[PDB]
Amino acid sequence: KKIITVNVNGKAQEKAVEPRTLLIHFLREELNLTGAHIGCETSHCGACTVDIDGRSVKSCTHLAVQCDGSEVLTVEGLANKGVLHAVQEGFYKEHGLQCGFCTPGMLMRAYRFLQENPNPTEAEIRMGMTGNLCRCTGYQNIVKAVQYAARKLQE
Amino acid sequence: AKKIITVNVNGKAQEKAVEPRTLLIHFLREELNLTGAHIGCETSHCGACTVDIDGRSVKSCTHLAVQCDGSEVLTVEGLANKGVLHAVQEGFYKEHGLQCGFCTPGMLMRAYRFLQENPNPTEAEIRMGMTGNLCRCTGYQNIVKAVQYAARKLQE
Amino acid sequence: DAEARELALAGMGASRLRKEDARFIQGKGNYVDDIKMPGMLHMDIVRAPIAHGRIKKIHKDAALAMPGVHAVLTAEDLKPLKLHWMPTLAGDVAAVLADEKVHFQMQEVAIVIADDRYIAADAVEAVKVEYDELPVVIDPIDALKPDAPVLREDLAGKTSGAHGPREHHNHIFTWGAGDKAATDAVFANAPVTVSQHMYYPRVHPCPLETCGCVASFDPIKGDLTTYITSQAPHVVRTVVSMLSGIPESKVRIVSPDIGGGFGNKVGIYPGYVCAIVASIVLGRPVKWVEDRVENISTTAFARDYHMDGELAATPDGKILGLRVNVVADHGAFDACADPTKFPAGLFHICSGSYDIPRAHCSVKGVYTNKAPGGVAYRCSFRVTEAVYLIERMVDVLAQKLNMDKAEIRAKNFIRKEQFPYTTQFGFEYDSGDYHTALKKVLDAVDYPALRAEQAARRADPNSPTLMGIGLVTFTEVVGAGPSKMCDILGVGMFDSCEIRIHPTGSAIARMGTITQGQGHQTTYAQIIATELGIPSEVIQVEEGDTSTAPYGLGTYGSRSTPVAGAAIALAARKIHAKARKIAAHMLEVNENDLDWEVDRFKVKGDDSKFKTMADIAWQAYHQPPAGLEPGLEAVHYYDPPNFTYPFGIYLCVVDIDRATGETKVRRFYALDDCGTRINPMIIEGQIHGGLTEGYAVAMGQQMPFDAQGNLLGNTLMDYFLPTAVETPHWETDHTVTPSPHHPIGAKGVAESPHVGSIPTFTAAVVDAFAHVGVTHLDMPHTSYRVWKSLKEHNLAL
Amino acid sequence: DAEARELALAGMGASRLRKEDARFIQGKGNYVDDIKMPGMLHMDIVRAPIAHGRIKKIHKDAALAMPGVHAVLTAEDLKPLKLHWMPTLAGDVAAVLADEKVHFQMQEVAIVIADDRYIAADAVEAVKVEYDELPVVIDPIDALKPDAPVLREDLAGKTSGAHGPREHHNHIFTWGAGDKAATDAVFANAPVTVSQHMYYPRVHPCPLETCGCVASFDPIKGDLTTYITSQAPHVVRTVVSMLSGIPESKVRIVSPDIGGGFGNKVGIYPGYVCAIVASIVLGRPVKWVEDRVENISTTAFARDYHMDGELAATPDGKILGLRVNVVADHGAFDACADPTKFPAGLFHICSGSYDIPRAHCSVKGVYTNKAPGGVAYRCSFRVTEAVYLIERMVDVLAQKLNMDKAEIRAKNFIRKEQFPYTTQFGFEYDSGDYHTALKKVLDAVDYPALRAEQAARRADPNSPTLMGIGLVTFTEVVGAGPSKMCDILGVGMFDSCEIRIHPTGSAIARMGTITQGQGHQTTYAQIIATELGIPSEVIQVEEGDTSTAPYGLGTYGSRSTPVAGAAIALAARKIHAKARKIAAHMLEVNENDLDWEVDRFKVKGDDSKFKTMADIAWQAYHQPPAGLEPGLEAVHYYDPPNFTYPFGIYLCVVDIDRATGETKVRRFYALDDCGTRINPMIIEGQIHGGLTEGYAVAMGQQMPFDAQGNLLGNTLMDYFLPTAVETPHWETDHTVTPSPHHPIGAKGVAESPHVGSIPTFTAAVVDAFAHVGVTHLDMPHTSYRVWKSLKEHNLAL
Numbered sequence A: 001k002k003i004i005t006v007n008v009n010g011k012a013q014e015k016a017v018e019p020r021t022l023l024i025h026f027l028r029e030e031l032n033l034t035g036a037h038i039g040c041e042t043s044h045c046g047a048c049t050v051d052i053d054g055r056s057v058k059s060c061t062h063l064a065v066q067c068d069g070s071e072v073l074t075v076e077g078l079a080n081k082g083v084l085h086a087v088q089e090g091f092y093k094e095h096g097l098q099c100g101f102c103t104p105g106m107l108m109r110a111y112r113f114l115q116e117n118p119n120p121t122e123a124e125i126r127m128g129m130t131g132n133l134c135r136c137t138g139y140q141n142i143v144k145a146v147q148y149a150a151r152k153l154q155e
Numbered sequence B: 001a002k003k004i005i006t007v008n009v010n011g012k013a014q015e016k017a018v019e020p021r022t023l024l025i026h027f028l029r030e031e032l033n034l035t036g037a038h039i040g041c042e043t044s045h046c047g048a049c050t051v052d053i054d055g056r057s058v059k060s061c062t063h064l065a066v067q068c069d070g071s072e073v074l075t076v077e078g079l080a081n082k083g084v085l086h087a088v089q090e091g092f093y094k095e096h097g098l099q100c101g102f103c104t105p106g107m108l109m110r111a112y113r114f115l116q117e118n119p120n121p122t123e124a125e126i127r128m129g130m131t132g133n134l135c136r137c138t139g140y141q142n143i144v145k146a147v148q149y150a151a152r153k154l155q156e
Numbered sequence C, D: 001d002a003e004a005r006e007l008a009l010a011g012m013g014a015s016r017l018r019k020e021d022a023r024f025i026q027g028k029g030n031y032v033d034d035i036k037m038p039g040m041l042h043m044d045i046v047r048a049p050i051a052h053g054r055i056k057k058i059h060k061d062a063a064l065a066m067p068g069v070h071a072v073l074t075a076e077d078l079k080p081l082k083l084h085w086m087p088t089l090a091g092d093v094a095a096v097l098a099d100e101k102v103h104f105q106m107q108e109v110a111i112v113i114a115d116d117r118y119i120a121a122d123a124v125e126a127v128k129v130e131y132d133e134l135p136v137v138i139d140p141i142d143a144l145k146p147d148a149p150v151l152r153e154d155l156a157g158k159t160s161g162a163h164g165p166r167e168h169h170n171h172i173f174t175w176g177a178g179d180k181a182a183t184d185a186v187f188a189n190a191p192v193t194v195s196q197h198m199y200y201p202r203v204h205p206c207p208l209e210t211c212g213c214v215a216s217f218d219p220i221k222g223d224l225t226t227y228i229t230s231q232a233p234h235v236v237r238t239v240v241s242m243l244s245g246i247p248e249s250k251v252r253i254v255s256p257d258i259g260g261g262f263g264n265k266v267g268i269y270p271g272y273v274c275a276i277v278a279s280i281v282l283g284r285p286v287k288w289v290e291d292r293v294e295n296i297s298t299t300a301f302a303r304d305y306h307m308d309g310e311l312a313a314t315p316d317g318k319i320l321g322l323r324v325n326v327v328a329d330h331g332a333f334d335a336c337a338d339p340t341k342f343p344a345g346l347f348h349i350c351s352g353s354y355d356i357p358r359a360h361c362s363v364k365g366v367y368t369n370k371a372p373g374g375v376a377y378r379c380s381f382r383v384t385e386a387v388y389l390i391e392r393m394v395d396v397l398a399q400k401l402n403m404d405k406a407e408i409r410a411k412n413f414i415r416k417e418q419f420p421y422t423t424q425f426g427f428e429y430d431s432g433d434y435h436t437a438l439k440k441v442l443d444a445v446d447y448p449a450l451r452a453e454q455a456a457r458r459a460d461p462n463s464p465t466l467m468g469i470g471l472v473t474f475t476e477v478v479g480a481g482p483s484k485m486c487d488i489l490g491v492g493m494f495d496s497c498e499i500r501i502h503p504t505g506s507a508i509a510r511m512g513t514i515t516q517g518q519g520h521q522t523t524y525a526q527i528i529a530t531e532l533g534i535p536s537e538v539i540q541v542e543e544g545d546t547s548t549a550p551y552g553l554g555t556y557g558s559r560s561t562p563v564a565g566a567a568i569a570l571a572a573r574k575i576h577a578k579a580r581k582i583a584a585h586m587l588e589v590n591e592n593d594l595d596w597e598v599d600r601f602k603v604k605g606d607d608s609k610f611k612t613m614a615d616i617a618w619q620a621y622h623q624p625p626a627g628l629e630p631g632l633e634a635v636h637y638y639d640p641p642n643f644t645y646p647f648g649i650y651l652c653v654v655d656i657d658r659a660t661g662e663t664k665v666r667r668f669y670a671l672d673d674c675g676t677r678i679n680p681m682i683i684e685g686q687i688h689g690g691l692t693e694g695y696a697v698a699m700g701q702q703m704p705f706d707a708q709g710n711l712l713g714n715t716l717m718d719y720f721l722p723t724a725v726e727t728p729h730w731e732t733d734h735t736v737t738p739s740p741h742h743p744i745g746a747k748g749v750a751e752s753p754h755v756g757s758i759p760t761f762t763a764a765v766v767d768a769f770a771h772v773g774v775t776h777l778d779m780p781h782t783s784y785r786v787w788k789s790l791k792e793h794n795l796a797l
């Protein structure tokens, strides 16, 4: 076991972790940040997507031990003092979620994608969200949610 | 500064670090979630917090956790064995020795030890041997019947 | 096979063991302080060291800087939410946190929230508060004097209150019942007249588990959930919703396992309001659990009635009239639990078990620098004071006429043939049979022999001990219900029950009541077992969760059996009716063609053709007969037509040590008649507990205040609670006189032992001094106080 | 203003935002794997590496000695409890843990219990199992051959199953509907005839959240609590109680937030049983959560129908008869979700949207070494197959007659005036207006212009791409209910709703259904909002907890709106009737003199005199008018009189790259008519999702097996799931043809997009090859398969 210190949602977390522990299990089992989900074992779905050191990463294909000294953000940390983040508001307003299983990952991806590309086209949105699968929405509303968030971020 | 200690509760080692002022009752309830033992006063009268420490009945609200490093603590959650109720638990159930059940855990732990100190107690001895435990619901009558029941079961 | 089947149900009348025990005997009960939630913080209260005074300034800086402390709130943080004050069941207002002044010692002045109760307690000590002392008011009589200080400056300029006109600034109300002019007329010319002043001391219910709550407002879902030591969670939910503006459907109040209530946990205390507010502000769970000193000092007390009883009669003992005048000490704020139309509860039941043609009572409540309360401690809304008043007076009457105390009662008892009886006060006693019950008790204890013995000891001027015999024949009034008459803050005092039968035959039941240890999970199941032919073991009853249980008024005043017990039977019967309709369809016969025999519907004249409740239940989910919805369930909201009137004959013998003043209960016989008995084992336990509370009240309990208003003896160091050694062996008996209007003829019983036993002890103590002229001795009857009497009457050693 | 009050309600017809979004968008949803209980252990399953063979020996010692491992159970540990096999919704039995042999690859052989999922996984690798491989059965046809191996050795000697007589050991059943004699006669004399063979490939619902549960048996209280990914928790409870011996009232099943169902989470999987048994044995919580590969490989699959469709007609295109024969592959055990009397579901709905005078269908169920299932992917009980068949056949008949595919449909449609229309199979279509919807779709896409572009492109033999136009006009049948014909394991297919109004006006409602993201918490609230004049925002709805919610059959087959929607309205209307009665008492008028206007009862003529629902609610708790019980609440179990028949008209245009076989959906227009619409926004989401599932199934999804019976492409590595890039922009339209029999005229709609889109894609792909004589091409239409067909018909490059 290696002792690490990861900054999760703005707070330092000094923990002892087994090297094989996937970041997704560390987030869900150790910190109880159960927003992030698991939809596959092949790294396709992206329901485990979290923001690590400025980038969108699928936490099921990253080790917690690798986050020693890293800056990690989850969906629980998106809202600011209770006020929803643009992306959270966008998915709500544009009905971008149903069962809500892929939502945390979608929000974390959109949160980063919008900083990568502030004024994306529909094609750019769809392509920029390719690492996230959804079984309920058909993606169409998710596109509108991202567009909605983009308009408010430049407001 | 918190002190690292290991307390044996119900045969299981409990490794914790607590401030010296931590009363045993809060250690059992707050640190171990063994919420059977209860708090009914701040003057050491009720006995709702009674647990068995190193072979003696003790009011955990008037004892420090830090004084139990290596001790053998018995709580109500540990009376039953393999699911089978201890004679004392069976006694309180069969004789209706409890209503709200707040003094019960303490009564049981006390009865458990009293019955070893005195296997064949008379009524007077039971009432006297159970004086450290207060009860607001029962009136004590069914409790002495419960202890008499447990006494008999232990001898057969 | 029919006798066995009924027995196998373990329903009505069975002494089946409790379903509750399993968890309690293994420490798996779930009380408020056992609750732990993610992010839960702890709250402690900064309380007033003085009894009356202005708040100059509160210092929060030191406490706030302490590591682990999250916030320190005062009445200033409560004003913007209009919560520094809150409505009481009595119609008055109570301070949540002391604003401009403190009205009683140990009052809630400020709160602190911290990581745990240890840091919290520290934070309380770190909070310094400056006060300007004001003249204290501790005696009700002194409180009404012209120059008496103004306590409630908040209602200055109000000539009326919630219960009528107010004649003085410390005067709360004046209530009366009965015929005044007629009563005065009897007393004006009656041949025999007795008068007695008596004080029913302020005592405290002191449940082993103190009050507490775990409030939790979820800012994400926008709804409040608070676990709490409440005897009326539904009423709390409605109240909390209105005071907070949070829609009621988004408010969930849950009373888990409670370590005894006794009336002490009926009201909303500032501690709850504060935790809720704190939770809403911090967006996380806040736990509050008071210590023993806090419970005895600040929560609802009981009694504190200064009574003046009078009795008018003819020389043979026949009572012609009753006149009573009371001064009630309600404390700083009137938060006395009672139906809104009865500021003195059901005190007008003081006519007792006697056919008194003319009577009138009058109660005047007054403010003092003490904690709110009055109704708590198994009292049924002042019935304790009523019973104590009448029985003490009948003893006074009997002693003046030199008539036997049992004989004078047998002479005035409402005869069995007179029921349903309407008293001089308007109550309609449902049923009774006092003479039979009395004779039974007298024979059981060899009453004449006791009198012969008492005569012998009195003959010897050197008998080392005094012998006293006490006898009480009382009538209780339980089952606060009649909505036209009774309501709690506007809610009619009905109750409810919902039963759902599952496809396989078992069932789930929920009521609007909430047990605190009286065995509802067992008894309720027994009522349903007999009504539906389903064993009580598999009828899972639950209470206390406002998001699942039907709306009810809670448990207190022994209203569960009378009201909820009725709702349960009727709801069960709605199911039984549908079960018959379904059984008829399956058996292909008419309804009045079926016979119900314990647990099945059989065809008349053909036993081989029947359908059990199990068969019917499956059928209900499988294929509902034409014109019937699938399923098999019902709900029933019962608005009782009348109260329930149980009774009892209590006798006690005491031996007083003339040298020390020590009183020893030699014997105590209690006969209770609560109509149809559900579970006698449970009934017996309730009797033992009630009589023990009585011994506590009469022999040792009190709440004395000094000249400066400090509450003395507010911990178990002094507050009396008998142990197994002080508690006498109780002898119990009973008779069965069912309530005609009740669905199962069941009457309440839990509060009877408490109400009746108290005056029995005083009757025994006073009877020991009767041969030297003593008519009454005020409670408590401790060795000290009793010695003072031996000394005064030259009976010492 | 009255209009403003109605808008303020956010009820029927409004596109209000969802109430359930708050928690999900903040990661505060509560799914099964999010649950952690004190002492919770984790379970993992040892699975068969082969498709068919006997179990020689299982080695448990290496795993048992592994630190962290508490238990390793096998079928041997299940036999005493008679749980090594469990009953299925199809009347067959499925192995919980393989006993003497394994019937399909990935089948559950043994389980391990460890401290966590990490150690648990290591334990599965440590458990070694020896097998004796036996010949595998993959093709349904080879399964029926005289020398085919005996799969179900447990059924040896039986000549009858739960669905009639069995003609072979691998033969499960044969079911038929319609008039065979009449249909055979029509085909014999029909001037025009067509017959086509088509395979509807086995696919998987693959919900993002896999199946799982946290079973918890409490030995102290003696009861079981299981949190589970179940689409029908109530029936699960009834089944669990039956198999465990634990009384039903002591069993509590709770479906929390579920990450999608789509029919995949309707059945009881062996993992659940093992978790329960393990929990009961160890005396503590056990968690089981399957991985993606386990979900695809062992949970309920969909389709797998080999169909032979036939259509009889006259030269002008009027359909005279329909004849269909089917071979169904149900896997090793028949656990196909279905009403007890329909082993092939509602396949006899294959008459479609057409007035076909004569028809007959026959489905033959067959066992193979594969995982069980069949009904589980927005299929409405085989309606997906029925629609695909009829629509495919109509296209074939259209091409043979050289008749336009839209024209032949308009000519065969059941006319608006024919409803309620009884089909050749016995269904009574509630309502419809196909013609108006068809013209609406054709106009919006300029269908004629489309055919001209296609004709112009076909004319050029060098056109780099092929243009295809697919059109589907379908009728659904949802709301599985009539208890006379529909039942799940003997339980009538009804549903319920309990609504309770609180003293202050807000409310709580529970139904027997269970949403999995379809929005019940919003939509259900909207239904009640309009019925009672209470804003939807404060009507809190809950489902899934068998201990609080009224008994229901759960949600699948789009039955919620049809069945529960009716129960909700009816239960609400019971409350409205009592409220009218109460309003009459308050206003001192007769009921008939009152008018309901959005949220209040007003006296006819005088508008100033009225009483809101808030006013009425309070009165119900204050003092009930004589004759009425206090409170304001109702319960209703709805046994539907008929199904609901929503319809649709979908059109799709595709462009196929002749050089690579790639198919690009250029356009898709979907028109759905589900009668009265509760929330247009929520309806639009269901359509988008279902069309996407349709695209996934038709263009990419499949579950191929090699000669040895190994499942290929059982992970997201190959199992097709479209991303935002592959998913096309959907165009939606609608019409409103209310269901006459439904309380609010609303029909189900969630499964329509799935059912209809699949054949629309194939219609478009086949139509692109139509000019060279192609009549059908089996799914999936992957680029690999389309290119294969491109080369065959000389259209490559």
Ligand SMILES: Nc1ccn([C@@H]2O[C@H](COP(=O)(O)OP(=O)(O)O)[C@@H](O)C2O)c(=O)n1
Pocket: C518, C519, C520, C523, C524, C555, C556, C557, C558, C559, C560, C561, C562, C674, C675, C676, C677, C678, C679, C680, C682, C683, C686, C746, C747, C748, C749, C750, C751
């Ligand atoms: N006739 C009666 C009255 C009460 N009881 C039982 O005694 C207990 C106290 O009943 P109660 O109605 O007097 O008081 P609460 O339960 O309102 O405290 C309840 O469990 C009972 O059902 C009984 O078995 N038979």
Ligand SMILES: Nc1ccn([C@@H]2O[C@H](COP(=O)(O)OP(=O)(O)O)[C@@H](O)C2O)c(=O)n1
Pocket: D518, D519, D520, D523, D524, D555, D556, D557, D558, D559, D560, D561, D562, D674, D675, D676, D677, D678, D679, D680, D682, D683, D686, D746, D747, D748, D749, D750, D751
């Ligand atoms: N006419 C209709 C039918 C469904 N719906 C809504 O769409 C969602 C799926 O409804 P549904 O009855 O077809 O399916 P399940 O919810 O049984 O999956 C439910 O929230 C709805 O209330 C609607 O708003 N209007």
Ligand code: FES
Pocket: A037, A038, A039, A040, A041, A042, A043, A044, A045, A046, A047, A048, A049, A058, A059, A060, A061
């Ligand atoms: S769980 Fe599927 S990509 Fe991480």
Ligand code: FES
Pocket: A096, A097, A098, A099, A100, A101, A102, A103, A133, A134, A135, A136, A137, D208, D259, D260, D517
């Ligand atoms: S909303 Fe269910 S998978 Fe995206």
Ligand code: FES
Pocket: B038, B039, B040, B041, B042, B043, B044, B045, B046, B047, B048, B049, B050, B059, B060, B061, B062
């Ligand atoms: S809490 Fe009262 S003696 Fe320990």
Ligand code: FES
Pocket: B097, B098, B099, B100, B101, B102, B103, B104, B134, B135, B136, B137, B138, C208, C259, C260, C517
């Ligand atoms: S049973 Fe309540 S204090 Fe003992």
